Amino acid sequence: SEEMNDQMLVRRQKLQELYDLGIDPFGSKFDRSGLSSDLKEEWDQYSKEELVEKEADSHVAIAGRLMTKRGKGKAGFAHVQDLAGQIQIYVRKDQVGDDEFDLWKNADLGDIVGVEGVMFKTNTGELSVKAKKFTLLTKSLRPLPDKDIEQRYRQRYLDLITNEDSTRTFINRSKIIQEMRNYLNNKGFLEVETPMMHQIAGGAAARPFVTHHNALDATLYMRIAIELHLKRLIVGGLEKVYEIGRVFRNEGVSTRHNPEFTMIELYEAYADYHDIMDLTESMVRHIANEVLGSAKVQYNGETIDLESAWTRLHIVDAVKEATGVDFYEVKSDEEAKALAKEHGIEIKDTMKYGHILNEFFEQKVEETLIQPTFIYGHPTEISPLAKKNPEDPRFTDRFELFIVGREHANAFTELNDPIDQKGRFEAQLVEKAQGNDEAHEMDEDYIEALEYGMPPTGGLGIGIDRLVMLLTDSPSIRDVLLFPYMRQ
Amino acid sequence: SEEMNDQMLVRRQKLQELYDLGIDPFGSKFDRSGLSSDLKEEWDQYSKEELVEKEADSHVAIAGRLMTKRGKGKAGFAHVQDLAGQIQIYVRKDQVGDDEFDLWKNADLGDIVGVEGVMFKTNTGELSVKAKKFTLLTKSLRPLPDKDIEQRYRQRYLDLITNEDSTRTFINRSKIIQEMRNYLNNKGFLEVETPMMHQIAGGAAARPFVTHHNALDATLYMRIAIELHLKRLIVGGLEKVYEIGRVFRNEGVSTRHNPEFTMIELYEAYADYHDIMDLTESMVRHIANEVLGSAKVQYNGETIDLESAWTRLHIVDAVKEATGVDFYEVKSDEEAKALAKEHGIEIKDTMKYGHILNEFFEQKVEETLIQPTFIYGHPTEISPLAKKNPEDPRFTDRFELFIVGREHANAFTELNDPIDQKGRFEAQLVEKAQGNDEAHEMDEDYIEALEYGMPPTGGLGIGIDRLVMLLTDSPSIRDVLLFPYMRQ
Numbered sequence: 001s002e003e004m005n006d007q008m009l010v011r012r013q014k015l016q017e018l019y020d021l022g023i024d025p026f027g028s029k030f031d032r033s034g035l036s037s038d039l040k041e042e043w044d045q046y047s048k049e050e051l052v053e054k055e056a057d058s059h060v061a062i063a064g065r066l067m068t069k070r071g072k073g074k075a076g077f078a079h080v081q082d083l084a085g086q087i088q089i090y091v092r093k094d095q096v097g098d099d100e101f102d103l104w105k106n107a108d109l110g111d112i113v114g115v116e117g118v119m120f121k122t123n124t125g126e127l128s129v130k131a132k133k134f135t136l137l138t139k140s141l142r143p144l145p146d147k148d149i150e151q152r153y154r155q156r157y158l159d160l161i162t163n164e165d166s167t168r169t170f171i172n173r174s175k176i177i178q179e180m181r182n183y184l185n186n187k188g189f190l191e192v193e194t195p196m197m198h199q200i201a202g203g204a205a206a207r208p209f210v211t212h213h214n215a216l217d218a219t220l221y222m223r224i225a226i227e228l229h230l231k232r233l234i235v236g237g238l239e240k241v242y243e244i245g246r247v248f249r250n251e252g253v254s255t256r257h258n259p260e261f262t263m264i265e266l267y268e269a270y271a272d273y274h275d276i277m278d279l280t281e282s283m284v285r286h287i288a289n290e291v292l293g294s295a296k297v298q299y300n301g302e303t304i305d306l307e308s309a310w311t312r313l314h315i316v317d318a319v320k321e322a323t324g325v326d327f328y329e330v331k332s333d334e335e336a337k338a339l340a341k342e343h344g345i346e347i348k349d350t351m352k353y354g355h356i357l358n359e360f361f362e363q364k365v366e367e368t369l370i371q372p373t374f375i376y377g378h379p380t381e382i383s384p385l386a387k388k389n390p391e392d393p394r395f396t397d398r399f400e401l402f403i404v405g406r407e408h409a410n411a412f413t414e415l416n417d418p419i420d421q422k423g424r425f426e427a428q429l430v431e432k433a434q435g436n437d438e439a440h441e442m443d444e445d446y447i448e449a450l451e452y453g454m455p456p457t458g459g460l461g462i463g464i465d466r467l468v469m470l471l472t473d474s475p476s477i478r479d480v481l482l483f484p485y486m487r488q
Numbered sequence: 489s490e491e492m493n494d495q496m497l498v499r500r501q502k503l504q505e506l507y508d509l510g511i512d513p514f515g516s517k518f519d520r521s522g523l524s525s526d527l528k529e530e531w532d533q534y535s536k537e538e539l540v541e542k543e544a545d546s547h548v549a550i551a552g553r554l555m556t557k558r559g560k561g562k563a564g565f566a567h568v569q570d571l572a573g574q575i576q577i578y579v580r581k582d583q584v585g586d587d588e589f590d591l592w593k594n595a596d597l598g599d600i601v602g603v604e605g606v607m608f609k610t611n612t613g614e615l616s617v618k619a620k621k622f623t624l625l626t627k628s629l630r631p632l633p634d635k636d637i638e639q640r641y642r643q644r645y646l647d648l649i650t651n652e653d654s655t656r657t658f659i660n661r662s663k664i665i666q667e668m669r670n671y672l673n674n675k676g677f678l679e680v681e682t683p684m685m686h687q688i689a690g691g692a693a694a695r696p697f698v699t700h701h702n703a704l705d706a707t708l709y710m711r712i713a714i715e716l717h718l719k720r721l722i723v724g725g726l727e728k729v730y731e732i733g734r735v736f737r738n739e740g741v742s743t744r745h746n747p748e749f750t751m752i753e754l755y756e757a758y759a760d761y762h763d764i765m766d767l768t769e770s771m772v773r774h775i776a777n778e779v780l781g782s783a784k785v786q787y788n789g790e791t792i793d794l795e796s797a798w799t800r801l802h803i804v805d806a807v808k809e810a811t812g813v814d815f816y817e818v819k820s821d822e823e824a825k826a827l828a829k830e831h832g833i834e835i836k837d838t839m840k841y842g843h844i845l846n847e848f849f850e851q852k853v854e855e856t857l858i859q860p861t862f863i864y865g866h867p868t869e870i871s872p873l874a875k876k877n878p879e880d881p882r883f884t885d886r887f888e889l890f891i892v893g894r895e896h897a898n899a900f901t902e903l904n905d906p907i908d909q910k911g912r913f914e915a916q917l918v919e920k921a922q923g924n925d926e927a928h929e930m931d932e933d934y935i936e937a938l939e940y941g942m943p944p945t946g947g948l949g950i951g952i953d954r955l956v957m958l959l960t961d962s963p964s965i966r967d968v969l970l971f972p973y974m975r976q
């Protein structure tokens with residue numbers, strides 16, 4: 001724009017003027033007595049007349065961004081924004097002196113300023129700081145935008161200045177994650193760090209990001225999951241371990257998806273998937289109560305009840321409820337393919353009984369699960385790391401947590417049998433050769449670890465970003481990431 | 489080996505025998521009353537005779553790995569290892585019954601077992617569990633190795649079972665990191681997450697790992713630092729932010745280096761590098777006192793004194809002390825190159841005054857800094873993101889922390905001037921074109937962020953793995969990583 005270029009030229013002139021006046025226009029350190037909220041908590045109780053008597057005791061020092069400005073004469077007003085919010089400042093020439101009032105006149109919207117002064121109230125009752133000393137801490141060379149929908153994601157720093165609701169989401173994200181640590185640390189779980197660069201990327205059904213080590217001439221994959229390294233630590237005897245960190249998945253383009261995202265994975269020796277259900281339900285309920293004050297949370301104008309007991313439903317029973325098809329009584333792959341055609345379930349011809357049952361669930365059931373629901377009993381074909389159910393080997397002791405129509409957690413009784421696990425890994429190569437590009441690879445070192453003996457173990461994975469979305473009432477993953485991935 | 493293959497065949501026979509006996513040889517969930525240390529804390533005070541009277545009150549349930557075994561008759565002993573340590577078990581046929589004693593006979597070293605029983609002591613005074621119920625929880629198909637130096641790194645799970653000192657290092661690593669969070673959270677710092685996949689990898693002098701997004705046909709770089717995204721949050725008004733996470737550097741091969749490692753980066757608005765010195769010194773001293781009980785720590789048989797005041801030394805004065813060369817009085821690049829030849833300092837012909845001063849420091853001084861030393865005043869040529877010193881523009885307001893002869897932290901008064909920062913970025917392209925492959929790229933979005941106005945800011949980066957090495961008395965980075973990078 002022509003107007004935008006003229007504003008930036010004026011700001012460059014004003015920068016040079018500050019150099020001519022003999023100050024550092026990008027500032028030195030600045031001591032502060034408090035934030036705007038501390039000033040309001042301590043002084044807003046008192047009236048205009050009471051504050052005049054307390055001027056000897058109300059000396060403060062604040063700093064922040066100039067958001068409003070008025071007064072072309074010898075007295076002027078402005079709103080200064082810091083982390084907590086805004087506070088009005090009052091700058092008189094007869095208070096700050098001639099040299100500092102030239103800096104006040106130079107100052108424009110967006111500049112960082114420091115103010116030392118005393119508290120007072122205007123005739124309208126607005127708590128303000130009467131400046132005794134004014135400091136221009138940083139000259140901004142570019143003005144803020146006033147009144148592009150993608151700018152808040154591409155330039156998050158502008159969103160954090162202009163939108164207070166955005167800042168609250170990220171503060172609550174930090175509290176949610178820290179409350180998860182505190183909960184698990186109090187129960188005896190050890191936080192660990194495992195490699196993000198894997199020789200073989202396993203632990204999930206997803207396409208990896210590939211990279212190259214130059215000095216070694218070696219191919220490395222960014223991790224798609226934290227699973228396989230954490231189960232090695234269970235073989236090593238650590239018993240209770242977890243890890244909160246980034247995973248990377250090279251999947252298709254979507255507003256619902258991000259190439260990198262934060263996961264917690266957790267493993268407890270001598271537990272099963274029912275113990276993990278209890279832990280997941282208790283932990284999420286606890287985090288909601290501590291951060292929000294209630295486990296009944298609003299999501300898109302609807303009350304999601306995490307306080308009351310969460311529903312537990314077998315995937316076969318969920319599909320039967322929705323479609324009338326009872327997959328217990330389906331006896332072959334051909335019968336499943338026939339039923340898939342009848343009920344309009346999009347499938348691939350390579351799919352079997354278990355794959356098709358899952359498509360019934362994903363296409364007809366999944367989205368209806370608004371209240372927190374543990375869907376369990378996932379078929380063996382889609383569950384390569386989960387132990388089989390003893391009473392019915394078609395299904396595994398696995399669950400997925402569904403809230404607001406989407407997956408929030410994945411968990412199972414772990415497969416500690418290295419013979420079966422070798423067999424699962426072999427069957428995933430059959431799928432990979434015939435057109436399933438996001439299938440499990442052959443990790444020989446992992447099988448070797450299981451052969452030394454892994455105890456019976458319960459494992460859990462929670463998508464942290466989706467949990468944060470739920471508890472902050474955010475419609476998209478781009479609202480809970482500070483710098484979400486944007487095209488170009 | 490032939491013997492190793494025979495052992496594994498015997499274990500497969502024993503696995504099949506357990507299936508024939510009608511148990512699950514890979515186990516179900518197992519409730520425990522405590523760890524071996526809880527049993528010792530509660531019961532080891534009492535004598536053999538006192539424990540017999542308390543058998544009604546001393547029912548316990550434990551589980552762990554079978555590490556020793558003796559007794560071929562109807563009574564046998566074994567040591568069971570859990571997270572805390574080992575406890576002896578005593579299994580009699582007349583206590584557990586015939587069916588469970590067959591499982592005891594089947595059990596071999598490395599198997600996971602569950603024992604429910606009562607406390608007692610042997611004639612030698614060893615606290616033990618007299619088994620009332622024995623459970624074989626997992627059959628191990630491969631025996632542990634007895635009495636290859638790289639096996640502890642390649643197979644960490646074996647090291648954690650056999651070496652108790654290794655387990656303590658990783659528990660203390662977790663405490664060190666959590667104590668850092670607690671310290672910073674109490675001072676008002678916000679923990680955040682920023683992208684690990686960058687469009688342009690900046691924030692340090694290092695070669696990046698390159699990768700490709702398939703669905704978008706876009707090139708992405710794994711982050712070499714956390715710096716540039718965190719300073720955007722300071723522009724956004726968050727004031728106090730930090731991030732503990734992985735960075736990735738595609739550098740040469742070494743035992744001292746790992747391709748991925750953990751960093752904390754921290755940024756405080758309205759602070760300078762002297763405030764960051766105070767913070768770094770206070771924080772590290774605090775973490776040492778809380779985790780170890782003292783800030784005087786042993787490293788390779790030598791007392792490193794973090795309790796007393798840390799030394800502060802200008803890089804020019806450090807070089808003058810070591811070599812006699814005063815770089816304040818060196819007036820040109822040719823004089824610096826001449827002095828470099830005289831004192832045997834390996835340099836490149838493209839290097840200037842500042843580059844050469846640093847080589848003097850790295851080759852003659854660095855390794856001698858055993859006690860904690862803030863080296864400051866780094867020259868502008870090697871400090872592209874640091875603000876210049878006002879009194880002497882040759883040097884920046886930067887420091888590096890040196891302990892036990894190596895770098896532990898990097899910090900500076902941040903360059904919030906977008907005109908100068910553009911100029912630094914332009915001068916790094918001059919170095920990149922003439923043979924400096926680990927130089928800074930041209931981030932236009934970052935410059936645009938600074939133009940909206942960044943306040944005066946102090947920034948800090950600490951290598952977490954090196955800090956953990958110091959405080960755990962570990963000689964190599966591979967000793968403080970659970971799964972360090974190994975060739976092949």
Ligand SMILES: N[C@@H](CCCC[NH3+])C(=O)O
Pocket residue numbers: 203204224225226227265410411412459460461462
């Ligand atoms: N690796 C799983 C999470 C853990 C599942 C239970 N072991 C995932 O990415 O979905």
Ligand SMILES: N[C@@H](CCCC[NH3+])C(=O)O
Pocket residue numbers: 691692712713714715753898899900947948949950
């Ligand atoms: N990006 C720096 C750490 C922060 C330096 C101070 N801003 C590094 O990797 O060394």
